[PDB]
């Protein structure tokens with residue numbers, strides 16, 4: 001497939017407020033969150049991945065095996081638990097987060113030297129794009 005390993009800096013963040021609102025994140029947390037420009041630090045070995053969303057407020061750590069369902073604790077975000085599976089879809093990663101909210105998930109992929117992340121919940125789409133510092 002592809003190796004996502006890298007320290008990726010955020011260039012684009014569209015519709016993040018609407019995504020967090022769909023997760024019932026409170027006004028307070030949303031206001032601060034929208035100002036953050038979280039980086040993604042990814043380390044990967046084959047089907048094992050650690051994806052760290054890094055900000056000056058809180059970090060969120062995902063540590064999983066592609067293809068293998070796990071209990072995802074979304075502490076710090078909406079503090080929900082999901083039954084989550086990240087799967088290969090050709091060269092993209094597709095994440096389905098089963099739980100309270102319908103259609104909750106995300107898609108991660110590389111186009112050239114850009115890392116694209118699309119986050120989804122209840123028909124709301126947030127678009128993020130990242131690049132490494134060369």
Ligand SMILES: CC1=C(/C=C/C(C)=C/C=C/C(C)=C\CO)C(C)(C)CCC1
Nearest residue numbers: 033038051053055058059060062077106
């Ligand atoms: C709201 C909120 C945050 C949301 C982080 C999210 C939503 C990360 C999603 C990552 C995905 C979907 C794939 C790679 O792990 C963080 C915790 C930065 C700071 C506290 C506020």
Ligand code: NA
Nearest residue numbers: 015016017018
């Ligand atoms: Na908006």
